[PDB]
Structure formats: C-alpha cells, structure tokens
Amino acid sequence: QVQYENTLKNFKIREQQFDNSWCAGFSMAALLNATKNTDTYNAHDIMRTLYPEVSEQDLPNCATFPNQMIEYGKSQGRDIHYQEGVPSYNQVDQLTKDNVGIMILAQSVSQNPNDPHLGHALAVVGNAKINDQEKLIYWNPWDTELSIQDADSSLLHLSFNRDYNWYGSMIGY
Amino acid sequence: MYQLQFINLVYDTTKLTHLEQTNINLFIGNWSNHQLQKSICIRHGDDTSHNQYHILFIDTAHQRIKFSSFDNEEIIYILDYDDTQHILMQTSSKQGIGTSRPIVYERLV
Ligand SMILES: [Cl-]
Ligand SMILES: [Cl-]
Ligand SMILES: [Cl-]
C-alpha cells in the first residue's frame, strides 16, 4: 500500500520502444512532453533531429551520446547536467515537485571483462513511500507501465529479467 | 510476405567447452515474429558463408550469446533463451547509449 506518491504533473506513457536503439529519444520525449505539457515530442523525431544525415533505413540503429542529451535539451530551452550515481529520495522529491525531469543512464551488469556492456536510458517519474520504505518511480521505454526502485539501490531489475546498474542521470528536462 | 534475416554464426566447436557448445545450439533454427513480420534463420556457418557473424561472448550462466556481423561492427546482437519454442533477440549500439527491447521470436515448425 502506498503511503505517499509524488510524480511529474503531466507525465503519460505515449509510445513504446521496440527494435531500435532510441531509448534516450523515448526518455527525453516523455520527460519533455511531461514538463512542457504537450504530446508533440516523440522518439523517432528526436533521433532524426540528432542524426540528420543518416538514411531512414539506418536510423533504428542510431544510439545517443551524453553530449547529444545535453545539446538536445538546450535546443528545447532546458539546462541539462550530468550527476554521477543515483539521486537521493529527497532530491527526486524536490525536482519532481519543481517539475524538473530526470533521465536515467544505466549499463547492463557484466559477467566478466569479455562480456560487452549495453547502455540504456530510462525516465524518472517521481518517488513514493510504499510499505514504509522510500522508492523511486521510473519508466523503461520497453514497457507500457511504470516501475519501482528501492531508493537505496543502483541495481535496476528491468523487464525480460535484465539487470542494469543506474550509474548516473541527466537532470533538467 | 515476411522479411528474412540470415545469421550464419562462424565459430570452431573444438575451441568451446561442452557447456558453451550446448548454449549456442539452443539458438540454431528458424524463428518468427508476427508483429514485425520478420523471420530469422540461425545456422552454424563456415568461413565461405554469406551473412557471417562472429561470437563476442557466451554466457552459460544466463543462457545468452552476444555476436556481431562484419557488415556493421557497431551493432551487437544479444540472444536469450526463453523456453523450448521461444528465444529473445535484442540489439545494442556498441557506441553510445541505446539498446532495444528484447524481441520475442517463436520457433518455425
Ligand atoms: Cl564494454
Ligand atoms: Cl567441457
Ligand atoms: Cl551461405
């Protein structure tokens, strides 16, 4: 049972990530649609904006770099900054009440040095107290629903039984 | 009509443990996804095959293999075993942050 829930005002899941590497476009689009109170951002268009030269055929395989996350943000009137680690429960609480969007940067949990890391971006939605414990609420673009994270943990248990480490965030959307 | 992707995995069984070979073999066969209208044909090819992919990692603990094609070394394919009639295929960009949803493929016959 939920004792307290604090989410971004106008956040709504509107599209879902399938066979492309556009998780940062999905996350930025959802955060910007939330803070700007619109439905006019979408993953495809953002990735197209980031990769003007790339053929339609090859666009699905384009991924996103940190500098693009910050510069795209700037073009939309947002001052984005990187923060290492997981944000605290109180920091998320303030940012969410202040209508400021947080993008999660996550990396797959690697078995040994030869096992390549996979990168994935997600959107923070807010925070909650559930059964007396502090939680962060997040949206994985692979999914059509929200997820719950122990605020004291950087280990994300994503759908399809995939674990990722939340290593840092881009704050300011 | 569906789109068909051939995946000719090139590797030398003499160099793999029995468990590594068992894991790769989980994925060999023909598989389909109705939503994408796309099918994949996974075989153990050889050095004169077309559509060659090489193995990057075999994860016996999680029943998962990662591999990539010489045609585009910037995309990593990740296959995960789901059950007897299904596998999951995911792609991830080698540079930058971006990894697809695992896509479910069901065994063709
Ligand atoms: Cl790596
Ligand atoms: Cl052995
Ligand atoms: Cl051939």
Explain briefly what this protein structure is.
Chain B: Residues 97-101 are annotated as: Binds to staphopain B. The complex is a heterodimer of chains A (173) and B (109). Chain A is α+β, with helices and mostly antiparallel strands and 173 residues long.
Can you offer a commentary on this structure?
With 173 residues, chain A is of the alpha+beta class. Chain A has helices at 23-36, 43-50, 66-75, 89-97, and strands at 2-7, 81-84, 102-108, 119-130, 133-139, 146-150, 155-158, 162-171. Chain A has one domain (1-173): Cathepsin B, Chain A (Alpha-Beta Complex). In chain A, strand 4 and strand 5 form a beta hairpin. The two termini of chain A are 30 Å apart. Chain B is built from one helix and eight strands; from the N terminus they run βαβββββββ. Chain B has one domain (1-109): beta-Barrel protease inhibitors (Staphostatins, Beta Barrel). Chain B is 7% helix and 54% strand. Chain B is mainly beta and 109 residues long. An eight-stranded mixed beta barrel of chain B has the order 1-3-2-8-7-6-5-4. Chain B starts with a strand and ends with a strand. Chain A binds chain B through residues 16-24, 61-66, 105, 108, 111, 114-116, 118-121, 141-142, 160, 162, and chain B through 36, 56-57, 59, 61-62, 66, 72, 74-76, 78, 80, 88, 90-103.
Defining traits:
heterodimer, A: 173 residues, alpha+beta, Cathepsin B, Chain A, 4 helices, globular, B: 109 residues, binds chloride ion
